[PDB]
Design a protein around this ligand. Structure first.
Ligand code: HEM
Ligand code: PKT
Length: 458
């Protein structure tokens, strides 16, 4: 097992028995990835316990796996942990099961569908400024994660389900409470450290019904969504996510409906608020850019005009800012696909069962692609420069048919928030503000201490 890469002629850190190369994650595993790049070059291998994982950095080879050969060989991600009824969630499903889920759910974010969500979010656009406005008065610092979290939440519930829960009215909300308690993925947390390293214990916990959210958060939402379904089940309106799954129960199912709902609620809450917090951090430690964006917004939307679908896409510099923030903090860290048969991609033999890994975080910081890769430089994404940029190196949303199904909704939502927040306020560091920011070594791409900034009226 541990002789695969030495035999296949592929370089790597020498694994230990049982552990594999586990102990190298103490640094945080984005750093591990970095080092390996710099040390081993353009392809390397390592072992998550007894699981061989082959990292790849070549743009062609990446394209092959993410795009050309997705259907035939590289179809699924690495088996998650114990997931019980969540095994049917789109992000976790495999093969035939996945293909249908993907085609059935993709019509949720289209040219028209997103368009229909603007006026709805717009209400929470309003409700956010009004939240901040009262802290803007007081003067003592603000945790963005929380204010953004509450926004994110409102926007996901109301769009997917057409259910206003007005979480911005509520630093006392059941939903954000249970939903945030959802993940325990810390690399250096006792739990998952034991699974990829005892992967044969997964089949066990499944029997026990012990989950990565043991019965609590899911029981909540189980009957929670059971609640939303029935109201709609009679009262006629809008054809939405909730609805599109009632359209296909005319070959979908009940626990199956609940599962995608959860995936969405998590994604829409956590991804969105986390990134939005990194963007505000940057705008504060880079005042020039904050002002320059505040100019773009004012010019396109004069007299603090309400943002819209088409005005949003008009904003070049906004987009540059978003893309640049994502270059630095590509929240997935790594893209992964399991090799489901013996294969040869661009000259290299890859054996069945191997996990092929793309280290987004590291490629986003590769000194051999990006001048001053540590520095936050939005201009590197201008129309002049936006085309020297390999879409198989810069991949914050993955690529190919298994890429981020939420991408377009993510961008609009985020931007829709930024616009409204920057046309009413400015943002500046204080002496809680960690300069420069530090990522936690724990498995998530998080700031180790929360992001806290000062908010002034305009
Ligand atoms: C800025 C926020 C976000 C980032 C950076 C992001 C990034 C990603 C990335 C990189 C992948 C995997 C791509 C690949 O492996 O090739 C992904 C998968 C996915 N994302 Fe997004 N995402 C974001 C927001 C969202 C939102 C708001 C939703 C809600 C709809 C969403 C739903 C999904 C689903 C369901 C998958 C698995 C796709 C599949 O297996 O078919 N994500 N996310
Ligand atoms: C645990 C559960 C079922 C609630 O969600 C997951 O599937 N877990 C993964 C890890 S969650 C943190 C990753 C992150 O910061 N956001 C990335 C993301 C999440 C959701 C949608 N779009 C982007 C979440 C996950 C689902 N599919 C993935 C593919 C690659 C990497 C992570 C994920």
């Amino acid at each position: 097992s541990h002789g695969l890469f030495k035999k296949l002629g592929i370089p790597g850190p020498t694994p230990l028995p049982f552990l594999g190369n586990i102990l190298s994650y103490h640094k945080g595993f984005c750093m591990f990835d970095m080092e390996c790049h710099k040390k081993y070059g353009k392809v390397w291998g390592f072992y998550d316990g007894q699981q061989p994982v082959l990292a790849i950095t070549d743009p062609d080879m990446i394209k092959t796996v993410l795009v050309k050969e997705c259907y035939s060989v590289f179809t699924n991600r690495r088996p998650f942990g114990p997931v019980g009824f969540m095994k049917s969630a789109i992000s976790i499903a495999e093969d035939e099961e996945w293909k249908r889920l993907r085609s059935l759910l993709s019509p949720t974010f289209t040219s028209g569908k997103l368009k229909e969500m603007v006026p709805i979010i717009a209400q929470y656009g309003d409700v956010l400024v009004r939240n901040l406005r009262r802290e803007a008065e007081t003067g003592k610092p603000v945790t963005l994660k929380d204010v953004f979290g509450a926004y994110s939440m409102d926007v996901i519930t109301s769009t997917s389900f057409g259910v206003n829960i007005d979480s911005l009215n509520n630093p006392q909300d059941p939903f954000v409470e249970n939903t945030k308690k959802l993940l325990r993925f810390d690399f250096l947390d006792p739990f998952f450290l034991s699974i990829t390293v005892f992967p044969f214990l997964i089949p066990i916990l499944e029997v026990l019904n012990i989950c990565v959210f043991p019965r609590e958060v899911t029981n909540f939402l189980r009957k929670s969504v059971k609640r939303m379904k029935e109201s709609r089940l009679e009262d006629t309106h809008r054809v939405d996510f909730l609805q599109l799954m009632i359209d296909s129960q005319n070959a979908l199912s009940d626990l199956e409906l609940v599962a995608q709902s959860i995936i969405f609620i998590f994604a829409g809450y956590e991804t969105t608020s986390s990134v939005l917090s990194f963007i505000m951090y940057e705008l504060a430690t880079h005042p020039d850019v904050q002002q320059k964006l505040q100019e773009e917004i004012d010019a396109v939307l004069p007299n603090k005009a309400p943002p819209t679908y088409d005005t949003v896409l008009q904003m070049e510099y906004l987009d540059m800012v978003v893309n640049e923030t994502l270059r630095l903090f590509p929240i997935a860290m790594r893209l992964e696909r399991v090799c489901k048969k013996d294969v040869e991609i661009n000259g290299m033999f890859i054996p069945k069962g191997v996990v092929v890994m793309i280290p987004s975080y590291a490629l986003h910081r590769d000194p051999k692609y990006w001048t001053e890769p540590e520095k936050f430089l939005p201009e590197r994404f201008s129309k002049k420069n936006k085309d020297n940029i390999d879409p198989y190196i810069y991949t914050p949303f993955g690529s190919g048919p298994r890429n981020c199904i939420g991408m377009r909704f993510a961008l609009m939502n985020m931007k829709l928030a930024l616009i409204r927040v920057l046309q009413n306020f400015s943002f500046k560091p204080c002496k809680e503000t960690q300069i420069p920011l530090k990522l936690s070594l724990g498995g998530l791409l998080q700031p180790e201490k929360p992001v806290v900034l000062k908010v002034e009226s305009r």
